[PDB]
Design a protein around this nucleic acid. Structure first.
Ligand SMILES: OC[C@H]1O[C@@](CO)(O[C@H]2O[C@H](CO)[C@@H](O)[C@H](O)[C@H]2O)[C@@H](O)[C@@H]1O
Ligand SMILES: OC[C@H]1O[C@@](CO)(O[C@H]2O[C@H](CO)[C@@H](O)[C@H](O)[C@H]2O)[C@@H](O)[C@@H]1O
Length: 574
DNA sequence: CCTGACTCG
DNA sequence: GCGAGTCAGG
């Protein structure tokens, strides 16, 4: 066993200006959740404190908020938010092991202290899952077992800080941790805690009108099929489409891509696609959303997973506010349900225009692509002009659409198969497009070749701010497995650098909002855009400040461009 | 608990 | 084709 003092009261030696701190929140969703225990490890020793006793002690609380008292933790955002819900401010977190491990190797999927420690051959700590269990069996163990687990985690963090910081320094990722990710952690904490206001009453009205339409398309489907069946059963649907109605096969696959091609054969296909759209808005964006709105404040408090994506992007859960409908008008209406939290306040949204491609232009130093952006040209029309060799005047809607698709392919790691599949054309033709694209953008071609070669030589690829991704399959003798890694080598520096940029913009924006003492604050981040809320009196100032700060986040060989809109609801901010 | 469907940048 | 999360079904 590990030695530790199971304290009954807080003592001075527990308030050293340097310590590994553990403020345990077992619940997955930490919003307004319980803190089941506390552990502190420092010069003087290892201690376990009960929350009701420590969070009531004015000295402990002052220590938690004393920024000069440095704390090392694992997932400090979790503790900070749980503490915000109790009116307690956590300050001075100088090292976060979860974020440190995430920068060192995102593929490891480090989600507990045990996994992080395993990276440095340290195993004197148990995986949280072995302690709390999971699912319907998850539970907080008795004090003895709980206290030892928390102390062991604190002791691990205490021991591992140095080794993790040393490696970060070698990787040139020390500043990435201390100046980007950790400060961002605190900003993400304020955003989650603030939450976003939902107009539940109008959301239930939409759910009512939706319920009526689904009933219509539903019965219309049973008619065209001359039989009732579970439309949501990919298995039952396959029977009705490929057996009863003899539709062509191009069990059974009824993916959206398949049905779009079957549409011309039978009227039922169109209806099944619409029914699926509406059915998705109903189950997820109506019923599912309402399930997570706080009844008392009518707010939803998302949780941004800051150490999950392989590219450095953020992810969002319970609910996922990074995938709210907008493409099809019927689903876009859902956004009229996200409103400001105060009367006379408005929603302000600012987004980078073509940041991936601008980053690509920068990194590849392609003359044509850099010139195009310097002229702030419509990138897809320009790409169409170059690959089809025609004047702007001769670009047809269909040419542009296809040049647009090629730009995606180039960004996601261009491949004969991938483009051909996306445009519903032959590979020989796709290779034809790609071929032409590289003729017009030789710089982009050189980069794709060089980055793949660099991935093979170094073993990984990096982003603008030194985030990295290891690509061991880049040397596989299996074509498919190797090709996956190659695309990643091409795409990660693009998607990854775009992530670094917007993360820094969030940090710069917040320092500016505070300098100006503006009431405006961040609500969400959707990969290449920032959503804020502020009194209407601050709109004119934000119109100049937000774009400015986002455009000046970093300096590239091409300018960064930001569009913005504001309105009464998220929907109107367009 | 795992597909196969949908949603987003 | 790159990166994500949620839900009804089986
Ligand atoms: O607190 C977020 C942080 O925790 C991890 C690991 O514990 O994920 C946990 O919390 C998420 C938000 O509720 C869940 O989606 C996830 O299933 C749960 O393990 C990290 O991945 C994350 O950075
Ligand atoms: O009780 C409803 C009953 O309807 C079936 C078809 O007869 O399913 C329809 O309605 C469901 C919603 O209640 C949808 O999920 C399903 O997609 C639609 O076909 C039966 O499965 C169900 O028992």
């Amino acid at each position: 066993k590990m030695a530790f003092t199971l304290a009954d009261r807080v003592t001075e030696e527990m308030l050293a200006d340097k310590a590994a701190l553990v403020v345990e929140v077992v619940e997955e969703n930490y919003h307004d959740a319980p803190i089941v225990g506390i552990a502190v490890v420092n010069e003087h020793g290892r201690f376990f404190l009960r929350p009701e006793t420590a969070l009531a002690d004015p000295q402990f609380v002052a220590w938690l908020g004393d920024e000069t008292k440095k704390k090392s933790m694992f997932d400090s955002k979790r503790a900070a938010v749980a503490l915000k819900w109790k009116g307690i401010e956590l300050c001075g977190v100088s090292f976060d092991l979860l974020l440190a491990a995430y920068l060192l190797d995102p593929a490891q999927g480090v989600d507990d202290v045990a996994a992080a420690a395993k990276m440095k051959q340290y195993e004197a700590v148990r995986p949280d899952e072995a302690v709390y269990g999971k699912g319907a069996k998850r539970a907080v163990p008795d004090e003895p077992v709980l206290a030892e687990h928390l102390v062991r985690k604190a002791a691990a963090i205490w021991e591992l800080e140095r080794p993790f910081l040393d490696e970060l320094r070698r990787n040139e990722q020390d500043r990435l941790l201390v100046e980007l990710e950790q400060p961002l952690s605190s900003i993400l904490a304020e955003m989650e805690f603030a939450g976003v206001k939902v107009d539940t009453k109008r959301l239930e009205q939409m759910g009512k009108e939706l319920a009526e339409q689904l009933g219509t398309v539903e019965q219309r489907i049973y008619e065209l099929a001359g039989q009732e069946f579970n439309i949501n059963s990919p298995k039952q649907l396959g029977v009705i489409l490929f057996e009863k109605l003899q539709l062509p096969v191009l069990g059974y696959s009824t993916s959206a891509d398949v049905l779009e091609k079957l549409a011309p054969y039978h009227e039922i296909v169109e209806n099944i696609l619409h029914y699926r759209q509406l059915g998705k808005l109903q189950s997820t964006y109506i019923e599912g959303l309402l399930k997570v709105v706080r009844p008392d404040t009518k707010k939803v408090h998302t949780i941004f997973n800051q150490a999950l994506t392989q590219t450095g992007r953020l992810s969002s859960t319970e609910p996922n506010l990074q995938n709210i409908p907008i493409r099809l008008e019927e689903g876009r209406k859902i956004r009229q349900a996200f409103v400001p939290s105060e009367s006379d306040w408005l929603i302000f949204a600012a987004d980078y225009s073509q940041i991936e491609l601008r980053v690509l232009a920068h990194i590849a130093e392609d003359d044509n692509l850099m010139e195009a952006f310097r002229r702030d040209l419509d990138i897809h029309t320009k790409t169409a002009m170059d690959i089809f060799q025609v004047s702007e005047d001769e670009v047809t809607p269909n040419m542009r659409r296809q040049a647009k698709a090629v730009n995606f392919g180039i960004v996601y790691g261009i491949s004969d198969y991938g483009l051909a599949q996306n445009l519903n054309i032959s590979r020989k033709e796709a290779a034809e497009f790609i071929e032409r694209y590289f003729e017009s953008f030789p710089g982009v071609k050189r980069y794709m070749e060089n980055i793949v070669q660099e991935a093979k030589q170094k073993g990984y690829v990096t982003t603008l701010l030194h985030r990295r991704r290891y690509l061991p399959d880049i040397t596989s003798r299996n074509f498919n497995v190797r090709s996956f890694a190659e695309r990643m080598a091409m795409n990660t520096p693009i998607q990854g650098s775009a992530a670094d940029i917007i993360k820094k913009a969030m940090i710069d924006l917040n320092a500016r909002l505070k300098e100006e003492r503006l009431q405006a604050h961040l609500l969400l981040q959707v990969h290449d855009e920032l959503i804020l809320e502020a009194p209407k009196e601050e709109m004119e100032r934000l119109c100049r400040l937000v774009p400015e700060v986002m455009e000046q986040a970093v300096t590239l060989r091409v300018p960064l461009k930001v569009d913005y809109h504001y309105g009464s609801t998220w929907y109107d901010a367009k």
